[PDB]
């Protein structure tokens with residue numbers, strides 16, 4: 001059989017998610033506690049959320065001038081980027097208060113993740129950035145490619161076992177990227193999740209976005225912008241032939 005490196009997803013559990021939350025960042029902390037960053041001018045926020053209920057336990061509303069983007073948690077601090085700017089915000093997770101700001105050298109601010117030592121960033125280009133959390137200088141730039149094509153639109157990120165997984169904006173795909181060298185290690189296809197919500201009558205929903213990993217219990221959670229549900233998912237390696245050019249069409253929008 002092929003080393004397909006393409007996965008489909010099974011829903012293990014469904015949980016409520018705020019259908020007014022324009023998800024741009026998603027983090028799993030501990031004890032069924034999530035952190036989330038939302039966008040939209042006048043609606044951007046960082047939130048502590050209970051997994052089981054989707055209840056917002058604590059919220060920090062941003063100034064109306066910002067469009068909140070990616071979010072990650074590193075050593076008790078939540079780091080957040082914002083659309084079109086090089087500024088980012090740091091919140092203490094104990095209080096959800098803004099303790100510090102920073103500036104990074106990306107070309108935009110879309111996604112953040114961490115391996116527990118440094119920050120990874122995306123900005124909608126095909127570059128996955130390594131960012132030093134002390135100096136906020138770039139450590140390295142990985143140019144992510146698939147079959148020679150640039151993988152642009154890298155969006156919400158999550159570090160999982162040596163990989164950085166990235167939503168690709170406006171697709172139902174997640175790229176699995178090597179944190180070591182930027183290699184495209186695999187593609188996850190999730191179109192069944194949005195389709196299921198549309199079929200349940202939730203017609204006003206926006207795109208798949210937001211990935212969070214619970215390392216302790218080995219749970220993967222995903223949601224989407226304005227989605228009324230957040231899903232716990234299990235990956236399954238494909239056991240069928242992927243048509244020529246399928247990933248290029250559906251995940252790279254070529």
Ligand SMILES: *[C@@H]1O[C@H](CO)[C@@H](O)[C@H](O)[C@H]1NC(C)=O
Pocket residue numbers: 030031
């Ligand atoms: C998570 O739950 C454990 C065990 O129930 C508890 O001791 C710990 O304080 C919790 N972690 C938090 C709230 O950060």
Ligand SMILES: *[C@@H]1O[C@H](CO)[C@@H](O)[C@H](O)[C@H]1NC(C)=O
Pocket residue numbers: 089098099100101
């Ligand atoms: C971060 O910068 C924003 C925008 O200028 C400002 O409102 C806030 O006070 C800053 N936070 C800190 C901790 O300096």
Ligand SMILES: [Ca+2]
Pocket residue numbers: 025026027071112113156157158210211212
């Ligand atoms: Ca994430």
